[PDB]
Amino acid sequence: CVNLTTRTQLPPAYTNSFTRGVYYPDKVFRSSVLHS
Amino acid sequence: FQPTNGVGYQPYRVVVLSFELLHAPATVCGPKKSTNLVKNKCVNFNFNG
Ligand SMILES: *[C@@H]1O[C@H](CO)[C@@H](O[C@@H]2O[C@H](CO)[C@@H](O)[C@H](O)[C@H]2NC(C)=O)[C@H](O)[C@H]1NC(C)=O
């Protein structure tokens, strides 16, 4: 692993995350229900 | 660990067995006298436990 020396700064930007990031909280199958 | 220590000082082998599942697939079972599958009649099921 060599030290890379071609970076160009450019401070990072930010993005408005949309409706993403929901996994299956538990291991139990369900159907036609609204679970909190 | 003196060879003639009192029983309050002698080596024990304290080991803890911890286990608590919620819905994970089973991988450990006991005597396991599991029988054949049965049909639409009323039966007492044990399946996964
Ligand atoms: C360049 O590579 C070296 C190799 O490890 C990185 O480590 C630095 O140099 C010596 C390693 O022999 C350490 O004593 C220093 O403390 C290290 N510096 C830092 C800031 O960690 C070095 O980090 C690399 N340079 C970078 C990534 O800019």
Side-chain angles (χ1 to χ4, degrees), chain A, chain B residues 1-19 21-22 24-49:
Chain A
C1 47
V2 295
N3 285 359
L4 295 185
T5 44
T6 306
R7 303 289 271 281
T8 46
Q9 322 305 296
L10 294 206
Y14 285 91
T15 292
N16 183 70
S17 299
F18 299 129
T19 49
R20 287 179 177 273
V22 186
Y23 55 91
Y24 285 81
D26 48 359
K27 329 305 180 182
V28 176
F29 161 82
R30 278 153 190 129
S31 175
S32 296
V33 297
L34 316 181
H35 176 69
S36 312
Chain B
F1 274 77
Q2 286 79 243
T4 56
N5 267 335
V7 288
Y9 304 96
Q10 300 282 24
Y12 278 114
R13 294 294 172 88
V14 181
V15 57
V16 301
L17 305 186
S18 190
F19 49 88
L21 69 88
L22 185 55
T27 51
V28 173
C29 289
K32 165 181 164 65
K33 191 38 57 193
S34 166
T35 57
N36 190 3
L37 184 145
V38 183
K39 311 308 171 325
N40 293 319
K41 53 178 76 173
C42 290
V43 181
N44 185 48
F45 52 82
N46 205 350
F47 270 98
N48 206 31

